């Protein structure tokens, strides 16, 4: 393992805000996208395995990691649509080319799957794990975290997240099988040290999960990429997890019907990158080497 970040953080202005990202190497990109409540830091022990396979990139979503916070912030800020506008602009600014390999997780998968559907001719391959592959019902949501997420999606959310930082301090460690070090937790809470709106992205995200028809716009978007991915011949690498969390039950059954897909299983709950980084990295590397023969 290791608590040290992969590369130095670079900054670029997007829509008036500064966004942070890692960009190492040259050639076609291998784009790693984190979800909630993480950052590019999530891929620190995985990206090394792809050394020499291309341009390794990991962006910090707006309001997360070292990226600027949006202000004024509130209940209407940091919705999926807003994150998409910033990420779309950042990915355009990075000049990725037309043979991109996406490596996604959680909300990074929702964003990545949607981007892929919209820019399909530029996607060489898609690696995903513990993703939001389709709209779901409450019965599809992990039983142990069901109550808590329903709470985030209620008036109690602000206190749980903005005041007590529950997503970072409780959910994150709770969904990692091995104990994190002081340094690792420090890196994860750094973007959310201040109570209040600074933590808004970690609350807006759970309120955006397409569950039981709400929110309607994200449900539609997920419905769209779910259908497309179930038909797309683009090469895929599905990293299943045991016991896993989000991508289990019906969603897992669905993902397993996707075309031209290779699958492996690694130990982990949700933030599996912290449990089996080497297995995950090795699998992604092999996937990319097959996609970029030489
Ligand atoms: Ca080329
Ligand atoms: Ca309940
Ligand atoms: Ca734990
Ligand atoms: Cl979430």
From Swiss-Prot:
GO molecular function, one term: haloalkane dehalogenase activity
EC code: 3.8.1.5
Broadest EC class assigned to this enzyme: hydrolase
Regulation of its function: Competitively inhibited by the key pollutants 1,2-dichloroethane (1,2-DCE) and 1,2-dichloropropane (1,2-DCP).
A GO biological process held by the record: response to toxic substance
Pathway(s) where this gene product acts: Xenobiotic degradation; gamma-hexachlorocyclohexane degradation
Main subcellular location: periplasm
Leader sequence residues: none
Gene3D superfamilies per record: alpha/beta hydrolase
Entry annotated with the keyword Hydrolase: yes
Induction (record text): Constitutively expressed.
Result of altering residue 149 to L/W/Y: Increase in activity
Family as reported in the entry's similarity comment: Belongs to the haloalkane dehalogenase family. Type 2 subfamily.
Family annotation (PANTHER family): EPOXIDE HYDROLASE (PTHR43329)
Miscellaneous: Is not N-terminally processed during export, so it may be secreted into the periplasmic space via a hitherto unknown mechanism.
HAMAP family: Haloalk_dehal_type2
Protein name: Haloalkane dehalogenase
Species for this entry: Sphingobium indicum (strain DSM 16413 / CCM 7287 / MTCC 6362 / UT26 / NBRC 101211 / UT26S) (Sphingobium japonicum)
């Amino acid at each position: 393992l290791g608590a040290k970040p992969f590369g130095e953080k670079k900054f670029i202005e997007i829509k008036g805000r500064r966004m942070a990202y890692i960009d190492e190497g040259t050639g076609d990109p291998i784009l790693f996208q984190h979800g909630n409540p993480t950052s590019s830091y999530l891929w620190r022990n995985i990206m090394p395995h792809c050394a020499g396979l291309g341009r390794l990139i990991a962006c910090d979503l707006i309001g997360m990691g070292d990226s600027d916070k949006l202000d004024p912030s509130g209940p209407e800020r940091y919705a999926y649509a807003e994150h998409r506008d910033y990420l779309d602009a950042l990915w355009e600014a990075l000049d990725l080319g037309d043979r991109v390999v996406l490596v996604v997780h959680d909300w990074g998968s929702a964003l990545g799957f949607d981007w892929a559907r919209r820019h399909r001719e530029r996607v060489q391959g898609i690696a995903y794990m513990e993703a939001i592959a389709m709209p779901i019902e409450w019965a599809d949501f992990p039983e142990q975290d069901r109550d808590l997420f329903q709470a985030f999606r209620s008036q109690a959310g602000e206190e749980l997240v903005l005041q007590d930082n529950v997503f970072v301090e409780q959910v994150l460690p709770g969904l990692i099988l091995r104990p994190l070090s002081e340094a690792e937790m420090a890196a994860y809470r750094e973007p959310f040290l201040a109570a209040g709106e600074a933590r808004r992205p970690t609350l807006s995200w759970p309120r955006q999960i397409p569950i039981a028809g709400t929110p309607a716009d994200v449900v539609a978007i997920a419905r769209d990429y779910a259908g497309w991915l179930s038909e797309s011949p683009i090469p895929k690498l599905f990293i299943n997890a045991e016991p896993g969390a989000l991508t289990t039950g019906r969603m897992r059954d669905f993902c397993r019907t996707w075309p031209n897909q290779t699958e492996i299983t690694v130990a982990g709950a949700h933030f599996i990158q912290e449990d089996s980084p080497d297995e995950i990295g090795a699998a992604i590397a092999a996937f990319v080497r097959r996609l970029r023969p030489a």
